[PDB]
Design a protein around this ligand. Structure first.
Ligand SMILES: COc1cccc(COc2cc(C(=O)O)ccc2-c2nn(C(=O)c3c(Cl)cccc3C(F)(F)F)c3ccc(Cl)cc23)c1OC
Ligand SMILES: COc1cccc(COc2cc(C(=O)O)ccc2-c2nn(C(=O)c3c(Cl)cccc3C(F)(F)F)c3ccc(Cl)cc23)c1OC
Lengths: 257, 262
C-alpha cells in the first residue's frame, strides 16, 4: 500500500519475468521491426518455405503439434514465474493447482500477442516467423483454430504494454479469487489487491499520457476469458475428428473440466 | 476536474432514480425486513399471488414453469425500455451515430438486466412487481426440465455480485460504463464511445474511493465482474436456444413473439 513497496514489487516481478520467459516482448519487437542484420528471422509463408525452414532454423498436424509442444513449455515457464509471486507458494496446495489450471491459458494468449503482429508470429525463440495468411490457410478446422489468436493479439497489442507492465498483469491473472473450486479465496484476493495496486501505479508512471489504461487493461481480461472458452470448444471438435492426434497429459489435465 | 466527475456522478444518480421503478436501497429495505410483500414459494401461492397482485403478463400455455418464464420475459422487455431511457441521459450518448446507439443498447441490455436484477435478489429469492411480491429461489430452482436450471445461475451471479455491496449511486455509473463499450460488434465510430467511457470510468473510480474508502481496489474488482457478466450472458443465450428448439408448447400469438424477438 506504500508507493515504495509497490515499486519494489513491480521491480521484483519484472526481474522474475525476465528470468522465467525466454523471449521478451522487447526482443520480439526488435526482431519484428527488423532494422537489424543479426536478429533476422527465416519466414515461412507456404509449404516449400516450411520444408526449407526446418533445414535452416500432414502439414496442419505437424504445425499443430508444434504449437502444442511450445504451449507445454509455456505452462512450465508460467508455473516457474508463479512460484516467484509473493504469497503464491504459501497458499493451499490445491488452490495453487487450481489457480494455474485456470490461469495458464489466459496467460499463453496474453504473451503470445507479444510475439505477434498483424502479419504473423515469431517461432523457435525468434529464429523463425510464420505468416498469418499461411496459418489461416491450413485445412479443415486448423486454419480457423490459428486465426482467433491473431485477432486477439492485434487488439491487445494496441495498448502498447511493455514487459514491465505484462509481468504485473500476468500475476493479477494468476491470483484470481473467482476461479472454480478454490478452497480459500480470501488470501488469494489479498495478494491480488497488492498486485492490482502495483499494476495501477506501474501504468500511471510508465504510461502517464494513457488515461484509464488500468481499466482498459482489466477489460481485456474479458476478451481473454471468452477466447479461452472458444479455444477449448474448438479443440474438442478437433479431437472428435482427428482420432490419430494426441495431446500432452499436462494439457489434457488442464482441459479436464 | 474532481468536481466534473462528482457532477457527472450526481447527474447519473439523479437520472437512475427517475428511470428505474425500484431502487436498490428500497429493495434492500424490503428484503432485510426493515408492507410485507406477498410470498410465492409454491404452486398454490403462485395461483393466489396473481389473483392478488394481478401480474400484467398473464395471457390466454397453462404449465407453471412456462408462465413464470414468460413473466421474466415480459419484465425484461420493460427493463430494456427503462435502460434505453436512462442511456439517453448519459452525457454524449444521444450525439453518437444513431446506428451506434442502437448497437450499444442491443449488446448492453442483457448485461445490465443481470446486474440490476441482483439489486432485487438475495440468497433466498427475488422481488417482483416493484417489491410487492417475493418469489423464492427454491421454488424457481425446482421448476422442471430446463427451467429450474435456467433460473438458478441468476441467483448464483447475484449472490457473488451483491457481496461488493454497491449502492445505487455506484451502480448508476457502472451501468453507464457497460453501455459505452467500444468493443461491441458493428460499431461505426468507436472513438467517441471510448472517450465517454473514459470519463465514466474516471467518475466511477472517484465515486468508489469516496463512497467506499475502506474497500481497497473495489474499482478493479467491479471491472473484473464484467468478465462474469459476459460469460453468463453467453450461457444465457445458449440456454434460450435450447428452450426454443425443445419446447413445442411455447407457442404464442405472432405479435407477442414479435414483441419478444430480441
Ligand atoms: C511449428 O510450430 C509453431 C507454428 C506456429 C506457431 C507456433 C508458436 O505458437 C505458440 C507460441 C507460444 C510461445 O512462444 O510462448 C505460445 C503458444 C503458441 C500457440 N499455442 N497455440 C495453441 O493452439 C494452444 C494455446 Cl494458444 C494454448 C494452449 C494449448 C494450445 C495447443 F496448441 F495445444 F492447442 C497456438 C495456435 C496458433 C498460434 Cl499462431 C500459436 C499458438 C509454433 O510453435 C513453435
Ligand atoms: C413471474 O414473473 C417473474 C418471476 C420471477 C422473477 C421475475 C422478475 O425477473 C426479472 C426482473 C427484472 C427487474 O425487475 O429488473 C429484471 C430481470 C428479470 C429476469 N430476467 N430473467 C431472464 O431470464 C432474462 C435476463 Cl436475466 C436478461 C435478459 C432477458 C431475460 C429473459 F427473461 F427475457 F429471458 C430472469 C431469470 C430468472 C429470474 Cl429469478 C429473474 C429474471 C418475474 O417477473 C416479474
Amino acid at each position: 500500500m506504500e508507493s515504495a513497496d509497490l515499486r519494489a514489487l513491480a521491480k521484483h516481478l519484472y526481474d522474475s519475468y525476465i528470468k522465467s520467459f525466454p523471449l521478451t516482448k522487447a526482443k520480439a519487437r526488435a526482431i519484428l521491426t527488423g532494422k537489424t542484420t543479426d536478429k533476422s528471422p527465416f519466414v515461412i509463408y507456404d509449404m516449400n518455405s516450411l520444408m526449407m525452414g526446418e533445414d535452416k532454423i500432414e502439414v496442419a498436424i505437424r504445425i499443430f503439434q508444434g504449437c502444442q509442444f511450445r504451449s507445454v513449455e509455456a505452462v512450465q515457464e508460467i508455473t516457474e514465474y508463479a512460484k516467484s509471486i509473493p504469497g503464491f507458494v504459501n497458499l493451499d496446495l490445491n488452490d495453487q493447482v487450481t489457480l494455474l489450471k485456470y490461469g495458464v491459458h489466459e496467460i499463453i494468449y496474453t504473451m503470445l500477442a507479444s510475439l505477434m503482429n498483424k502479419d504473423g508470429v515469431l517461432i523457435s525463440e525468434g529464429q523463425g516467423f510464420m505468416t498469418r495468411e499461411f496459418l489461416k490457410s491450413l485445412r479443415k478446422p486448423f486454419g480457423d483454430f490459428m486465426e482467433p489468436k491473431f485477432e486477439f493479439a492485434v487488439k491487445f497489442n494496441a495498448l502498447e504494454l511493455d514487459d514491465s507492465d505484462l509481468a504485473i498483469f500476468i500475476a493479477v491473472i494468476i491470483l484470481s479469487g473467482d476461479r472454480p473450486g478454490l478452497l480459500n479465496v480470501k488470501p488469494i484476493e489479498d495478494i491480488q489487491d497488492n498486485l492490482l495496486q502495483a499494476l495501477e501505479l506501474q501504468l500511471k508512471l510508465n504510461h502517464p499520457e494513457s488515461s484509464q489504461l488500468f481499466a482498459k487493461l482489466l477489460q481485456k481480461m474479458t476478451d481473454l476469458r471468452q477466447i479461452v472458452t472458444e479455444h477449448v470448444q474448438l479443440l474438442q471438435v478437433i479431437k472428435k475428428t482427428e482420432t490419430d492426434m494426441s495431446l500432452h497429459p499436462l494439457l489434457q489435465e488442464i482441459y479436464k473440466d
